[PDB]
């Protein structure tokens, strides 16, 4: 039913509408397109910078999930823009996206994955906790981690 591919530029507008519909319509987050410039240039911000951006796609090749990673200093990384279509959330698509990131991090000598998220993503918190992430304090984040978010997590790979 589902395949994981690297983001390509054809998906720019679809990706942005996907993320924004979930953020604004489903979670009622006060955020919009111009708050998220990284999405305007994914190749530049994620792929060309030593990061990752993967799409979970269905049989029609439409986006049903997303996951990004930025590379930090000191061989660490930050998870970004993880989203899964509501109609596909108990098909283990989040797990498959994460697994792809973890495997790619191992190839690229990344020791760990930090993330920040909002309390409004209730299910995502339990997901991270159930998938190797421990909750950390804001003062525990490294200096190259970009601070935005009210809940922080870390998963050790090494
Ligand atoms: Ca705005």
mmCIF file of N, CA and C in Angstrom, residues 22-127:
data_model
loop_
_atom_site.group_PDB
_atom_site.id
_atom_site.type_symbol
_atom_site.label_atom_id
_atom_site.label_comp_id
_atom_site.label_asym_id
_atom_site.label_seq_id
_atom_site.Cartn_x
_atom_site.Cartn_y
_atom_site.Cartn_z
ATOM 1 N N UNK A 22 -3.086 19.679 8.058
ATOM 2 C CA UNK A 22 -2.971 19.005 9.356
ATOM 3 C C UNK A 22 -2.769 20.007 10.510
ATOM 4 N N UNK A 23 -1.765 20.871 10.374
ATOM 5 C CA UNK A 23 -1.439 21.897 11.378
ATOM 6 C C UNK A 23 -2.607 22.818 11.719
ATOM 7 N N UNK A 24 -3.228 23.373 10.672
ATOM 8 C CA UNK A 24 -4.243 24.429 10.823
ATOM 9 C C UNK A 24 -5.658 23.921 10.975
ATOM 10 N N UNK A 25 -6.017 22.924 10.177
ATOM 11 C CA UNK A 25 -7.378 22.408 10.195
ATOM 12 C C UNK A 25 -7.611 21.399 11.296
ATOM 13 N N UNK A 26 -6.705 20.435 11.429
ATOM 14 C CA UNK A 26 -6.909 19.350 12.398
ATOM 15 C C UNK A 26 -6.460 19.698 13.816
ATOM 16 N N UNK A 27 -5.288 20.326 13.940
ATOM 17 C CA UNK A 27 -4.743 20.671 15.259
ATOM 18 C C UNK A 27 -4.967 22.123 15.695
ATOM 19 N N UNK A 28 -5.556 22.923 14.805
ATOM 20 C CA UNK A 28 -5.845 24.324 15.076
ATOM 21 C C UNK A 28 -4.601 25.094 15.582
ATOM 22 N N UNK A 29 -3.435 24.796 15.007
ATOM 23 C CA UNK A 29 -2.192 25.484 15.370
ATOM 24 C C UNK A 29 -2.135 26.848 14.692
ATOM 25 N N UNK A 30 -1.772 27.879 15.446
ATOM 26 C CA UNK A 30 -1.683 29.232 14.886
ATOM 27 C C UNK A 30 -0.344 29.305 14.150
ATOM 28 N N UNK A 31 -0.375 28.925 12.885
ATOM 29 C CA UNK A 31 0.850 28.855 12.083
ATOM 30 C C UNK A 31 0.410 28.911 10.643
ATOM 31 N N UNK A 32 1.222 29.486 9.774
ATOM 32 C CA UNK A 32 0.840 29.457 8.367
ATOM 33 C C UNK A 32 2.033 29.278 7.451
ATOM 34 N N UNK A 33 1.862 29.459 6.147
ATOM 35 C CA UNK A 33 2.945 29.154 5.220
ATOM 36 C C UNK A 33 4.186 30.028 5.408
ATOM 37 N N UNK A 34 3.976 31.320 5.658
ATOM 38 C CA UNK A 34 5.094 32.249 5.785
ATOM 39 C C UNK A 34 5.822 32.146 7.132
ATOM 40 N N UNK A 35 5.335 31.295 8.043
ATOM 41 C CA UNK A 35 6.056 30.951 9.271
ATOM 42 C C UNK A 35 7.027 29.804 9.031
ATOM 43 N N UNK A 36 6.968 29.186 7.849
ATOM 44 C CA UNK A 36 7.721 27.958 7.594
ATOM 45 C C UNK A 36 8.507 28.040 6.298
ATOM 46 N N UNK A 37 9.418 29.030 6.198
ATOM 47 C CA UNK A 37 10.214 29.192 4.978
ATOM 48 C C UNK A 37 11.040 27.971 4.564
ATOM 49 N N UNK A 38 11.448 27.108 5.494
ATOM 50 C CA UNK A 38 12.229 25.914 5.129
ATOM 51 C C UNK A 38 11.494 25.076 4.110
ATOM 52 N N UNK A 39 10.164 25.051 4.189
ATOM 53 C CA UNK A 39 9.353 24.311 3.224
ATOM 54 C C UNK A 39 9.391 24.890 1.793
ATOM 55 N N UNK A 40 9.811 26.140 1.633
ATOM 56 C CA UNK A 40 9.899 26.763 0.316
ATOM 57 C C UNK A 40 11.080 26.238 -0.505
ATOM 58 N N UNK A 41 12.098 25.724 0.185
ATOM 59 C CA UNK A 41 13.336 25.293 -0.439
ATOM 60 C C UNK A 41 13.806 23.994 0.291
ATOM 61 N N UNK A 42 13.110 22.862 0.135
ATOM 62 C CA UNK A 42 13.435 21.614 0.850
ATOM 63 C C UNK A 42 14.777 21.051 0.421
ATOM 64 N N UNK A 43 15.064 21.018 -0.882
ATOM 65 C CA UNK A 43 16.362 20.530 -1.364
ATOM 66 C C UNK A 43 17.466 21.327 -0.679
ATOM 67 N N UNK A 44 17.347 22.649 -0.674
ATOM 68 C CA UNK A 44 18.370 23.470 -0.096
ATOM 69 C C UNK A 44 18.459 23.298 1.425
ATOM 70 N N UNK A 45 17.323 23.389 2.107
ATOM 71 C CA UNK A 45 17.340 23.336 3.586
ATOM 72 C C UNK A 45 17.587 21.958 4.187
ATOM 73 N N UNK A 46 17.194 20.893 3.495
ATOM 74 C CA UNK A 46 17.298 19.521 4.030
ATOM 75 C C UNK A 46 18.268 18.642 3.276
ATOM 76 N N UNK A 47 18.090 18.510 1.962
ATOM 77 C CA UNK A 47 18.878 17.572 1.186
ATOM 78 C C UNK A 47 20.306 18.021 0.939
ATOM 79 N N UNK A 48 20.511 19.287 0.592
ATOM 80 C CA UNK A 48 21.835 19.784 0.233
ATOM 81 C C UNK A 48 22.707 20.128 1.416
ATOM 82 N N UNK A 49 22.079 20.176 2.586
ATOM 83 C CA UNK A 49 22.713 20.574 3.820
ATOM 84 C C UNK A 49 23.189 19.387 4.623
ATOM 85 N N UNK A 50 23.083 18.180 4.080
ATOM 86 C CA UNK A 50 23.499 16.986 4.812
ATOM 87 C C UNK A 50 22.369 16.375 5.620
ATOM 88 N N UNK A 51 21.136 16.804 5.347
ATOM 89 C CA UNK A 51 19.957 16.296 6.036
ATOM 90 C C UNK A 51 19.196 15.289 5.206
ATOM 91 N N UNK A 52 17.918 15.101 5.540
ATOM 92 C CA UNK A 52 17.027 14.159 4.882
ATOM 93 C C UNK A 52 15.615 14.718 4.792
ATOM 94 N N UNK A 53 14.889 14.304 3.770
ATOM 95 C CA UNK A 53 13.461 14.548 3.720
ATOM 96 C C UNK A 53 12.832 13.423 2.896
ATOM 97 N N UNK A 54 11.993 12.640 3.578
ATOM 98 C CA UNK A 54 11.350 11.462 3.015
ATOM 99 C C UNK A 54 9.841 11.641 2.981
ATOM 100 N N UNK A 55 9.224 11.048 1.968
ATOM 101 C CA UNK A 55 7.777 11.058 1.821
ATOM 102 C C UNK A 55 7.266 9.637 1.816
ATOM 103 N N UNK A 56 6.199 9.400 2.567
ATOM 104 C CA UNK A 56 5.451 8.158 2.472
ATOM 105 C C UNK A 56 4.370 8.475 1.450
ATOM 106 N N UNK A 57 4.276 7.632 0.416
ATOM 107 C CA UNK A 57 3.348 7.853 -0.660
ATOM 108 C C UNK A 57 2.486 6.609 -0.907
ATOM 109 N N UNK A 58 1.271 6.834 -1.379
ATOM 110 C CA UNK A 58 0.360 5.739 -1.656
ATOM 111 C C UNK A 58 0.511 5.254 -3.111
ATOM 112 N N UNK A 59 -0.410 4.399 -3.547
ATOM 113 C CA UNK A 59 -0.392 3.823 -4.894
ATOM 114 C C UNK A 59 -0.536 4.862 -6.008
ATOM 115 N N UNK A 60 -1.179 5.982 -5.689
ATOM 116 C CA UNK A 60 -1.340 7.096 -6.620
ATOM 117 C C UNK A 60 -0.169 8.088 -6.547
ATOM 118 N N UNK A 61 0.808 7.731 -5.720
ATOM 119 C CA UNK A 61 2.032 8.494 -5.470
ATOM 120 C C UNK A 61 1.787 9.848 -4.754
ATOM 121 N N UNK A 62 0.678 9.928 -4.032
ATOM 122 C CA UNK A 62 0.399 11.104 -3.236
ATOM 123 C C UNK A 62 0.962 10.945 -1.847
ATOM 124 N N UNK A 63 1.289 12.075 -1.243
ATOM 125 C CA UNK A 63 1.864 12.129 0.086
ATOM 126 C C UNK A 63 0.844 11.717 1.122
ATOM 127 N N UNK A 64 1.200 10.712 1.927
ATOM 128 C CA UNK A 64 0.394 10.312 3.077
ATOM 129 C C UNK A 64 1.213 10.459 4.386
ATOM 130 N N UNK A 65 2.503 10.796 4.268
ATOM 131 C CA UNK A 65 3.342 11.046 5.391
ATOM 132 C C UNK A 65 4.635 11.767 5.024
ATOM 133 N N UNK A 66 5.217 12.434 6.019
ATOM 134 C CA UNK A 66 6.439 13.194 5.816
ATOM 135 C C UNK A 66 7.365 13.072 7.012
ATOM 136 N N UNK A 67 8.654 13.276 6.764
ATOM 137 C CA UNK A 67 9.632 13.324 7.865
ATOM 138 C C UNK A 67 10.891 13.998 7.355
ATOM 139 N N UNK A 68 11.383 14.960 8.114
ATOM 140 C CA UNK A 68 12.613 15.669 7.805
ATOM 141 C C UNK A 68 13.661 15.511 8.900
ATOM 142 N N UNK A 69 14.916 15.714 8.526
ATOM 143 C CA UNK A 69 16.015 15.704 9.466
ATOM 144 C C UNK A 69 17.005 16.769 9.077
ATOM 145 N N UNK A 70 17.400 17.586 10.055
ATOM 146 C CA UNK A 70 18.545 18.477 9.850
ATOM 147 C C UNK A 70 19.748 17.985 10.647
ATOM 148 N N UNK A 71 20.912 18.204 10.076
ATOM 149 C CA UNK A 71 22.152 17.874 10.694
ATOM 150 C C UNK A 71 22.658 19.040 11.565
ATOM 151 N N UNK A 72 22.997 18.746 12.821
ATOM 152 C CA UNK A 72 23.514 19.754 13.768
ATOM 153 C C UNK A 72 25.015 19.600 13.859
ATOM 154 N N UNK A 73 25.675 20.409 14.691
ATOM 155 C CA UNK A 73 27.115 20.233 14.978
ATOM 156 C C UNK A 73 27.312 18.981 15.862
ATOM 157 N N UNK A 74 28.544 18.507 15.970
ATOM 158 C CA UNK A 74 28.892 17.444 16.921
ATOM 159 C C UNK A 74 28.146 16.116 16.626
ATOM 160 N N UNK A 75 27.920 15.886 15.335
ATOM 161 C CA UNK A 75 27.293 14.693 14.796
ATOM 162 C C UNK A 75 25.912 14.375 15.348
ATOM 163 N N UNK A 76 25.178 15.413 15.746
ATOM 164 C CA UNK A 76 23.817 15.229 16.171
ATOM 165 C C UNK A 76 22.877 15.681 15.044
ATOM 166 N N UNK A 77 21.579 15.557 15.283
ATOM 167 C CA UNK A 77 20.575 15.893 14.266
ATOM 168 C C UNK A 77 19.277 16.312 14.937
ATOM 169 N N UNK A 78 18.411 16.968 14.165
ATOM 170 C CA UNK A 78 17.085 17.353 14.601
ATOM 171 C C UNK A 78 16.008 16.856 13.631
ATOM 172 N N UNK A 79 14.992 16.204 14.193
ATOM 173 C CA UNK A 79 13.834 15.725 13.433
ATOM 174 C C UNK A 79 12.875 16.899 13.202
ATOM 175 N N UNK A 80 12.350 16.993 11.985
ATOM 176 C CA UNK A 80 11.449 18.048 11.585
ATOM 177 C C UNK A 80 10.292 17.539 10.743
ATOM 178 N N UNK A 81 9.166 18.245 10.853
ATOM 179 C CA UNK A 81 7.998 18.067 9.978
ATOM 180 C C UNK A 81 7.564 16.625 9.806
ATOM 181 N N UNK A 82 7.392 15.914 10.916
ATOM 182 C CA UNK A 82 6.840 14.572 10.869
ATOM 183 C C UNK A 82 5.311 14.627 10.959
ATOM 184 N N UNK A 83 4.661 14.130 9.920
ATOM 185 C CA UNK A 83 3.209 14.177 9.780
ATOM 186 C C UNK A 83 2.732 12.923 9.067
ATOM 187 N N UNK A 84 1.537 12.451 9.426
ATOM 188 C CA UNK A 84 0.933 11.269 8.828
ATOM 189 C C UNK A 84 -0.527 11.571 8.631
ATOM 190 N N UNK A 85 -1.029 11.275 7.446
ATOM 191 C CA UNK A 85 -2.432 11.467 7.136
ATOM 192 C C UNK A 85 -3.293 10.758 8.210
ATOM 193 N N UNK A 86 -4.350 11.440 8.675
ATOM 194 C CA UNK A 86 -5.259 10.907 9.708
ATOM 195 C C UNK A 86 -5.855 9.577 9.261
ATOM 196 N N UNK A 87 -6.235 9.494 7.989
ATOM 197 C CA UNK A 87 -6.801 8.264 7.420
ATOM 198 C C UNK A 87 -5.819 7.109 7.246
ATOM 199 N N UNK A 88 -4.548 7.307 7.629
ATOM 200 C CA UNK A 88 -3.495 6.287 7.497
ATOM 201 C C UNK A 88 -2.651 6.112 8.766
ATOM 202 N N UNK A 89 -3.139 6.568 9.927
ATOM 203 C CA UNK A 89 -2.325 6.548 11.174
ATOM 204 C C UNK A 89 -2.210 5.219 11.948
ATOM 205 N N UNK A 90 -2.966 4.192 11.576
ATOM 206 C CA UNK A 90 -2.753 2.890 12.216
ATOM 207 C C UNK A 90 -2.393 1.853 11.135
ATOM 208 N N UNK A 91 -1.424 2.257 10.310
ATOM 209 C CA UNK A 91 -0.797 1.400 9.309
ATOM 210 C C UNK A 91 0.739 1.390 9.532
ATOM 211 N N UNK A 92 1.175 1.870 10.700
ATOM 212 C CA UNK A 92 2.595 1.959 11.070
ATOM 213 C C UNK A 92 3.470 2.765 10.086
ATOM 214 N N UNK A 93 2.866 3.790 9.477
ATOM 215 C CA UNK A 93 3.563 4.686 8.539
ATOM 216 C C UNK A 93 4.583 5.586 9.265
ATOM 217 N N UNK A 94 4.220 6.112 10.435
ATOM 218 C CA UNK A 94 5.173 6.871 11.264
ATOM 219 C C UNK A 94 6.436 6.075 11.581
ATOM 220 N N UNK A 95 6.250 4.822 11.978
ATOM 221 C CA UNK A 95 7.347 3.897 12.295
ATOM 222 C C UNK A 95 8.260 3.703 11.089
ATOM 223 N N UNK A 96 7.663 3.420 9.923
ATOM 224 C CA UNK A 96 8.407 3.230 8.678
ATOM 225 C C UNK A 96 9.217 4.475 8.275
ATOM 226 N N UNK A 97 8.612 5.655 8.425
ATOM 227 C CA UNK A 97 9.321 6.919 8.183
ATOM 228 C C UNK A 97 10.511 7.059 9.130
ATOM 229 N N UNK A 98 10.271 6.875 10.427
ATOM 230 C CA UNK A 98 11.329 6.968 11.427
ATOM 231 C C UNK A 98 12.461 5.981 11.186
ATOM 232 N N UNK A 99 12.103 4.731 10.940
ATOM 233 C CA UNK A 99 13.069 3.681 10.607
ATOM 234 C C UNK A 99 13.985 4.067 9.441
ATOM 235 N N UNK A 100 13.409 4.730 8.430
ATOM 236 C CA UNK A 100 14.159 5.183 7.264
ATOM 237 C C UNK A 100 15.178 6.215 7.670
ATOM 238 N N UNK A 101 14.740 7.152 8.503
ATOM 239 C CA UNK A 101 15.624 8.164 9.086
ATOM 240 C C UNK A 101 16.719 7.479 9.946
ATOM 241 N N UNK A 102 16.347 6.585 10.861
ATOM 242 C CA UNK A 102 17.349 5.941 11.729
ATOM 243 C C UNK A 102 18.402 5.187 10.907
ATOM 244 N N UNK A 103 17.960 4.433 9.911
ATOM 245 C CA UNK A 103 18.883 3.708 9.032
ATOM 246 C C UNK A 103 19.816 4.663 8.287
ATOM 247 N N UNK A 104 19.272 5.772 7.783
ATOM 248 C CA UNK A 104 20.073 6.747 7.040
ATOM 249 C C UNK A 104 21.058 7.462 7.966
ATOM 250 N N UNK A 105 20.646 7.723 9.201
ATOM 251 C CA UNK A 105 21.524 8.330 10.189
ATOM 252 C C UNK A 105 22.707 7.414 10.500
ATOM 253 N N UNK A 106 22.454 6.113 10.581
ATOM 254 C CA UNK A 106 23.530 5.168 10.836
ATOM 255 C C UNK A 106 24.562 5.178 9.708
ATOM 256 N N UNK A 107 24.097 5.204 8.459
ATOM 257 C CA UNK A 107 25.010 5.283 7.327
ATOM 258 C C UNK A 107 25.829 6.570 7.374
ATOM 259 N N UNK A 108 25.229 7.653 7.850
ATOM 260 C CA UNK A 108 25.884 8.954 7.828
ATOM 261 C C UNK A 108 26.608 9.344 9.118
ATOM 262 N N UNK A 109 26.805 8.382 10.018
ATOM 263 C CA UNK A 109 27.503 8.601 11.304
ATOM 264 C C UNK A 109 26.889 9.664 12.226
ATOM 265 N N UNK A 110 25.561 9.683 12.276
ATOM 266 C CA UNK A 110 24.831 10.574 13.168
ATOM 267 C C UNK A 110 24.556 9.778 14.434
ATOM 268 N N UNK A 111 24.948 10.356 15.563
ATOM 269 C CA UNK A 111 24.868 9.729 16.871
ATOM 270 C C UNK A 111 23.529 9.830 17.577
ATOM 271 N N UNK A 112 22.699 10.773 17.164
ATOM 272 C CA UNK A 112 21.454 10.983 17.879
ATOM 273 C C UNK A 112 20.551 11.942 17.185
ATOM 274 N N UNK A 113 19.305 11.986 17.659
ATOM 275 C CA UNK A 113 18.227 12.760 17.089
ATOM 276 C C UNK A 113 17.483 13.494 18.188
ATOM 277 N N UNK A 114 17.513 14.823 18.100
ATOM 278 C CA UNK A 114 16.764 15.695 18.970
ATOM 279 C C UNK A 114 15.501 16.116 18.244
ATOM 280 N N UNK A 115 14.478 16.515 18.983
ATOM 281 C CA UNK A 115 13.312 17.142 18.383
ATOM 282 C C UNK A 115 12.616 18.008 19.411
ATOM 283 N N UNK A 116 11.922 19.024 18.913
ATOM 284 C CA UNK A 116 11.007 19.834 19.698
ATOM 285 C C UNK A 116 9.639 19.668 19.042
ATOM 286 N N UNK A 117 8.584 19.696 19.840
ATOM 287 C CA UNK A 117 7.227 19.592 19.335
ATOM 288 C C UNK A 117 6.296 20.390 20.267
ATOM 289 N N UNK A 118 5.022 20.521 19.910
ATOM 290 C CA UNK A 118 4.065 21.332 20.687
ATOM 291 C C UNK A 118 3.178 20.387 21.491
ATOM 292 N N UNK A 119 2.591 20.846 22.605
ATOM 293 C CA UNK A 119 1.806 19.940 23.430
ATOM 294 C C UNK A 119 0.527 19.502 22.715
ATOM 295 N N UNK A 120 0.112 20.276 21.701
ATOM 296 C CA UNK A 120 -1.124 20.027 20.928
ATOM 297 C C UNK A 120 -1.044 18.718 20.127
ATOM 298 N N UNK A 121 0.168 18.301 19.751
ATOM 299 C CA UNK A 121 0.363 17.005 19.102
ATOM 300 C C UNK A 121 0.445 15.915 20.176
ATOM 301 N N UNK A 122 -0.713 15.607 20.768
ATOM 302 C CA UNK A 122 -0.851 14.645 21.865
ATOM 303 C C UNK A 122 -0.362 13.241 21.481
ATOM 304 N N UNK A 123 -0.876 12.725 20.369
ATOM 305 C CA UNK A 123 -0.508 11.401 19.896
ATOM 306 C C UNK A 123 0.977 11.291 19.528
ATOM 307 N N UNK A 124 1.523 12.326 18.901
ATOM 308 C CA UNK A 124 2.932 12.332 18.516
ATOM 309 C C UNK A 124 3.865 12.162 19.715
ATOM 310 N N UNK A 125 3.475 12.671 20.885
ATOM 311 C CA UNK A 125 4.294 12.568 22.123
ATOM 312 C C UNK A 125 4.417 11.102 22.519
ATOM 313 N N UNK A 126 3.279 10.419 22.600
ATOM 314 C CA UNK A 126 3.255 8.996 22.892
ATOM 315 C C UNK A 126 4.021 8.202 21.843
ATOM 316 N N UNK A 127 3.908 8.602 20.575
ATOM 317 C CA UNK A 127 4.665 7.948 19.506
ATOM 318 C C UNK A 127 6.181 8.041 19.750
#
